[PDB]
Structure formats: C-alpha cells, structure tokens
Amino acid sequence: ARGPRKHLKRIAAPHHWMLDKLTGHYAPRPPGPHKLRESAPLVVLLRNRLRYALTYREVMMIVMQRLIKVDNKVRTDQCYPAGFMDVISIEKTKENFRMLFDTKGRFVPHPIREEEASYKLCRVKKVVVGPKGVPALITHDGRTMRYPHPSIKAHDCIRLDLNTGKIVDTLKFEAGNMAMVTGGHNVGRVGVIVHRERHLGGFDIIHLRDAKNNEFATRISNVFVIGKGEKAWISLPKEKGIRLSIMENRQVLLKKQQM
Amino acid sequence: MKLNLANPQAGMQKTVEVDDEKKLLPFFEKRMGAEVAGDSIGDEFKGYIFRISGGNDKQGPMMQGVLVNHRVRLLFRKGMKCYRQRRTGEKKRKSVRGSIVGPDLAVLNLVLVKKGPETIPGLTDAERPRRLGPKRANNIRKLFNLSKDQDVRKYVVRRQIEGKKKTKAPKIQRLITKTRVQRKRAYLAKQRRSVIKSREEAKAYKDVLSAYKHELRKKR
Amino acid sequence: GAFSLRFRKLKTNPLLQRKQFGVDILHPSRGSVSKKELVEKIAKQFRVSDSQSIVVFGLKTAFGGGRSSGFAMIYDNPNAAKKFENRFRLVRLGYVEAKPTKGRRAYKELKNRRKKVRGKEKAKCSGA
RNA sequence: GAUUCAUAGUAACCGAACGGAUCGCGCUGCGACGGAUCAUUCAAGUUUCUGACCUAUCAGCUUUCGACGGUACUGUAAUGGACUACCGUGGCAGUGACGGGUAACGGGGAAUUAGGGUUCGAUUCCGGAGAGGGAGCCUGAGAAACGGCUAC
RNA sequence: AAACUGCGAAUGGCUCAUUAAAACAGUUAUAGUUUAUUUGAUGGUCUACAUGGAUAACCGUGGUAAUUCUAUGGCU
C-alpha cells in the first residue's frame, strides 16, 4: 500500500531466474528498459549463470570497477534489468554475451563474436509523431529512434548500430519471416510465420511453424521477428529453438550422463 | 526582574538584578520594539534609551505580534519563532508569553539605541571583533568599496592561528575565474551543435520521404 | 599421513584478479586436513609465488572418512587478495590480525544519546 | 476495431512553467547534479463479467435530507448522484431483495487411503484492513501515516 | 567533528478486530487518469566576465523544577 514496494521476495520472484528456495529469504529486485518478469537482473547473471561472483557483495566489487557495459554504456547499478536482446560487454576476457531465451524458457547469456556484438535488434511497439511534426519509433527496449523510413510499421524489428545511434537494417512483419517467441507457453521457440488472425477488438494471434513441422500459436506481443524466410540476422542458442519432446528430452539427457 | 542589557555595536552584554518595584514601572504596558527611557533603571544608567526585544516568564519566550498580557497556546507553522522542527511538515502546539509586558515575567531582553555620557563596566568598555569576514565576492566588494575593477583576492581577511604557522581563508564563491567562464563556452557549444545536427537530420529526412513517395507514384 | 589433491570447477576470473576452484582430496589413514598444511601443497602444485595469495575455506570430510572436499581461491598478489576478500576468511589463515571493535549494543546506546544533545555532541563519546 | 487522438495551422489570452547565475577530473573530451514536456519502467486509482457459510420464528426494501434516470454546473489526478440546482417517477425482489447470525479477513492451499465428497485455511506467498477508540490534517512522487502532528 | 541542504523515513515487520456482491479470485477496460526514480528522446528566439540579503553550527549569553523546550545579541 501507500507507495511502491522496495523489496521483492524469493519464491515470489520469477521461476525462470532459478533462484533456490533456501539460502536467502529475499531475492534481488530489478525499473529499466525492461519489465520485472520479462527481464533478469545483472546480479544473477554474474553469480547464478556466469559464476564469476560467489556473493552479493562480490557483484558490487565487480560492477564498481566499471568493467561491465551494456549497449556500449557502463551501468554501475547491480540490479539493472538486462532483458531480451541486450548485449553485455566485458573488456577483460574480451568476451560478449547477447541474452536470448533458451528453449526450456530461461534466460541464458549466449556467447558471440566481436563484430556481431556491435548490433542488436529492437521490435517496435508503435510509431508516433513528436513535436515540430517529426515522426518517431518506440521500441520494446524503450528507446525512441527518430526520422525512420516511412516503410517501417508496427510489430517489426530494426537492427540498431549502437556504436552510433542510428538504424541500419529494417525488417518487415509478414508470412515467411523468421520469428522467436519472447513470452507465454511457447517461449524460446523459433519458426516461420504461416498466418495471423485479426479478431477486430482485442488480441491478434499468430499460428506459426517450427523447422520440424510442428505448428503452434501465440499472441503478437510475445512474437518477435528475427529475420527473413529462413536465415536470420542473429546467432541462435543451442537447439535453435526447436523444443524437442518430453520423452526425447529424457532420452538425450540420460544418454549424456552415462558418459 | 533580571534585565539582560545588550550592546549591538560593540558586541557586549551583562545581566543586572532589579531592586524595588519602581524601576520596572516604565516598562509595564509596553510592546516589543518600543524605545523606552533607561534613565530610571539605575544610577550609572543616565541618558540611555533602550529598544525592548523579548523576554521569558517564570515558566521560561514571548514573540512579537501575539499581543495580550498572559501566556497562550499556539499551533506553529514552519518559519515561526520559538519552534525548531523535528520533521518536515510538522506543526506543533506550544505555550508562549504575550508581547505586551507585565510584572510577573522573569527576564526582559533589551537592546540599546543611543548611549549617554556615562560608561557601563559590562557594555561600553570593550569591543569583541567580528569572527568571519565576507565569503562571497560582492559582499567583500561592498565592505571596502572596490567598484568592480579593483579585484578581490588580496582584500581577503586572514587571521593566523596560535602555535603552528598557518592561515585560514574563506574560498570566495561567485568569483569569476578560468573554470567558470569555460563552462559557459562548453555548455553553449553543445546548444549550438545539437541544433545544427537536428536541423540537418530534418533536411536529410525531407528528401528521403520525397524520394520514397515519388517511387510510390511509379506503382500507380 | 599425506593426501592426494585434485581440483574441480576451475574458473579463471581476471575481473576479480583471482582463480576459483573446488579442491577434492583423498587421505586414507589420516583424520582431516588442516588449512596450514593444505595451503603448502596447493602452492607447490600450482607453482605459486607466496602462500598469502592463496585462501582456502569450506572442507567437509564425508561420511565414513578417507574422502574430503572444499573450496579454494588463488589470487595474484597478496595485496589484491586483501582488498577483494572479506577479512574473516583471511583471519582464519592468519594473514591479517582481527580488528577489535566495540559491541553492537554499546554502539547503539551512543547514537540514541547523540540524538538528544544538539550542538557539540562529542562529550558523549568519552562519557559512555 | 473505433474519436474532438498524435501533429500542423489560425486568432488572442497569463506569468501562476521551462529555455542551467551549479560542481568535479583533465581551441578540447568525459560525468556529477538540477529541471520541463514526451514516451518507458516500478506502480497506484478507479473499472467489465462470473463466483460465497447458516437463517423465511427475517417479505417486501429504497425516496421530500440521492432512492433510479435526464439536462447544465461544481469537484476530482480523471469517469461518475461524487456534489449542487431544476425535471421525470423510477430502481431491486420468490433464481431469496431488505434484515439477522458467524466461536468469517479472501485466495494460493491443508487434512481426509475407490469414485463423488465432507471439514479446515489467525499462520511462509499474493491481495485487504488496522496501529487503544473514533475524527481531522501538514509535508511529499506517493500517507488521510501513527516507532508524524492537532482534538475529544 | 558540528551544522545547513539533498534523499529516505509511505518499504519492511507485526496482527486478524472489522468486513457477506463488500473484500478477494480469475477475466477485461483506462479513447476516464496521476506517476519520485530508471532508460531513451527532444530544445539558441525571454550588469550574460556573473544580481540580491538572511540563516545556522560557531562566539558571547540567559530563562525554567523538568524534555530531542529554546529566547535576546553579534558574524558567514
């Protein structure tokens, strides 16, 4: 009541962080570009994915060196919400991490090449006219690129340059274009787009087809266009967003563990 | 009863006890900020005149403008007298003496305007000098009268401390200098640069959208 | 009785100027291993300069005895190790002497008295 | 999906708001702080539909002092009988209104060995309400706050 | 050190007395609105080598039986 809540609790955290039940009563709380449940804070990358830090203390000792950057910019706050399709860049080690969705429905820092780690994609939420009658995009990231093409519509991605501010490569939202899912049940799945239903009132949905010919649906808010009909602007994680079945995921896992 | 006599200009003061009733009788039914004659307070006090500033009564404050001859309870805002705030926005109710003077209060505080011929042993004899000279720049200028072109710096006030060799000095705020004038030039450069960038972005875009919609006329 | 060393989960960490790894150790006959004896052996394995760079913690012997496993953390320089590591871990090793602070209840009783006096408050320090 | 939306243009209005009298490292770079509008994020306030234990030895409730609706103010962060003027006579109820009881905060859940059920949920999380009883209010982005204030 | 300014103190913690289409639950809407902070934008158009005078702490000094009570005087 009475104002914004400064604590978040463990358990009442998101499940896709995979913070454990014991070993803490509270969990780190991420406001930044991204939402609370559609992001992951910079602490649980460093300690609970990348395994650089042990403790919450040690993440302060890393981040206040000014070694961590995101989007070619130094972020000093340890609880910064670093979300979908943000680049992370550490100068020592000289390795870069683009955050994608894993096929199971988790965040994972996908390691990438140095030339690839310049650019990143931003799907545009809407397009809107600012003052002096100038046009302007706005993104899922909460950037606002201005003077686009007239070409560029809602619900489609743009390759940003990052080294400079400006856009470079557009993409369109149509049938036969590659598209990852960012939320809901089918998260972490990439497939070409077959068809979308309108439903003139609320909630457009899209059916789309995995590269092993599995068909599945999501709302348009969740869908995020990568690239053209086959091929893709970005590098993909392990499995490339197929999501193999429950008995298959059993068989591959226990076949691994026997060595 | 116990008159606290203040010299403003010297910076000296000392309390005195009042024998008898009749020496207090000029002061009764008088406001704060009233120039009362201080001939009849005692023997040595001759040809004086005293403004009356405040006081406290047995209870132990009076504030000007309240009026009345007795203690009262008031709700205090921020920026009143006789109240330090603990919290921001805190008002509080608090007992306070009237401004008009009576017998039953303990202390009157008095401030002299014009001293007479005679000397007081407490007040008149000495002069305590002022501790801090002026920090900011045009306050130093108005002290000694410099115009502007005389320049500050050398007209600083520096006492030196006892024992070890050391001076201490105010650091003059609002002083014109190499860092301060450059910060305008750095700021005003960005205001110049940010306009002409955004203007050329608009001029570049104007031909691009015309180049787009001309290629759309080919489709017709 | 001696022991056999064999590290695991190694992670070279140049941001923190240190190397982190779980140790695993095998000691038939012997009851446990002291950290003063373990830090000497892990020094000569890893070809280190100075014991003071290395710091070691954890170490549970498993049920039955013979086996044990723990954590370890080779810095480079002892001066970098003194900065990034918290002081309690260094102290067990003995590199740095313990800091004798006053009690938590005693410190709290100063500041509540310090609330009451405005002006110059520093007479309360000697008074408590 | 849809406007009196965004935005541009025209004619004037007011001062009651922005257009940096600020600070550090080093013709020239970096970032600390301030503040306006527009998104964004953490939110919050209202809001649509559907859902609950016992009781008929509770059958008729609501209204001139807002009950249901209409027009035009006012008020609010905005929508509204939220409030004020006039105007109409409505609204709910036998599918349980209105009133009473609860040893009643709600839910996620818990116990209970076919299936169907019955009883519990003050209590780890998410809402809600409260700081002896009621009421009022300042400051602030946010409180009708109580380890803030005023009164009985 | 002290004091002024800024920010926080509206989170957290505790309890279950209220409360029966109320609250709450899932499900909408905000074209019916406010939003510190974060993130990204924007913007020359109204003595400009720099405007004004008071306030603490501090110093001098009191009141009251008594408190996180505080007055008068002098500086910045």
mmCIF file of C-alpha atoms (C1' of nucleotides) in Angstrom, chain D residues 65-66 69-72 81 84-88:
data_model
loop_
_atom_site.group_PDB
_atom_site.id
_atom_site.type_symbol
_atom_site.label_atom_id
_atom_site.label_comp_id
_atom_site.label_asym_id
_atom_site.label_seq_id
_atom_site.Cartn_x
_atom_site.Cartn_y
_atom_site.Cartn_z
ATOM 1 C "C1'" C D 65 -32.164 15.135 3.699
ATOM 2 C "C1'" G D 66 -29.833 10.996 -3.831
ATOM 3 C "C1'" G D 69 -32.698 8.244 -14.640
ATOM 4 C "C1'" G D 70 -32.171 13.332 -17.661
ATOM 5 C "C1'" U D 71 -30.085 18.264 -18.749
ATOM 6 C "C1'" A D 72 -26.375 22.116 -17.143
ATOM 7 C "C1'" G D 81 -25.635 11.498 -7.683
ATOM 8 C "C1'" U D 84 -25.389 21.292 -6.281
ATOM 9 C "C1'" A D 85 -29.710 23.451 -8.918
ATOM 10 C "C1'" C D 86 -34.167 22.409 -11.598
ATOM 11 C "C1'" C D 87 -37.005 17.979 -14.165
ATOM 12 C "C1'" G D 88 -39.088 12.967 -14.698
#
